[PDB]
């Protein structure tokens, strides 16, 4: 599965770098992860979802890898889920954006 | 059993070994194994309020039993508890519900 | 030039030698020793209230004392702050008070005893 996040995550960040928002794509896939983590899963996904074309991209592909067909889907899955599968999402998610952030780092 | 922690861990043990006998052990322990974790992430009034509007009955014994190891009549008191505490007596007894979930589930590891 | 976390550090060193100097030096020691506790467990904004909540002036000097080094007029100035300011601005802003916080707490340990 992590190889399943490492490959769709790079692959996405692959296709990223080559767009005129890369720079920003970039700084949104560094930051998810502290959001995440200190804001929470519901609080961070609403910061991504709500400007910059470049941001909410990476929400959208984050999304995608996790087999969400958007964004939003993701977050209202976030918000559907009952405490266990909450956090089990937002462990899910973590792992997933440490990718994009790494492969962000790296190719960007 | 000087230690506070030591008398919770031994009111603890005979709660998870009463419930090892009955039917439903299964469910106790299940539950008895994600207490803690529910606690820290998602804090004590969430995780007390996801063990008292659980469906099964082995369920919700657990949170209970913990109660009244923390000296509680049961989890509708505990939950009372928490939720008309300031803050520093609020962290205090998410310290302490955490530290008993612990030995709840270690014993119920152990014994079911 | 100083970094700005030095600077921090320095003026709560200041703001500290002068509450050793006054009265309740211990409530004031004791709220600063557990401010950084607060920030980390209960958050930015939590942490603030209770401290304005308090009673006794010497764990209140502490909060409008920590505004202040951080360049807020007082401690009611850095709370609003605290709830207008968006996500990115809150956290970030939690990590500054945090900052500022832990040296309260390090120069209370070496000279409020």
Redesign the interface.
């Known amino acids: 599965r992590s190889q399943v996040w490492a490959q769709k995550a790079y692959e996405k960040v692959r296709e990223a770098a080559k767009g005129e928002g890369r720079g920003e794509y970039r700084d949104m896939a560094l930051?998810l992860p502290?959001?995440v983590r200190?804001?929470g899963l519901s609080?961070a996904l609403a910061?991504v979802d709500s400007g910059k074309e470049a941001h909410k991209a990476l929400g959208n592909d984050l999304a995608q890898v996790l087999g969400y067909r958007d964004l939003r889907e993701l977050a209202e899955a976030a918000r559907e889920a009952?405490?266990?599968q909450?956090?089990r999402l937002?462990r899910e998610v973590l792992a997933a954006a440490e990718w994009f952030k790494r492969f962000a780092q790296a190719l960007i």
Do not use: I
């Open positions: 930051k502290v959001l200190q804001a609080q910061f009952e405490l266990l909450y956090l937002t």
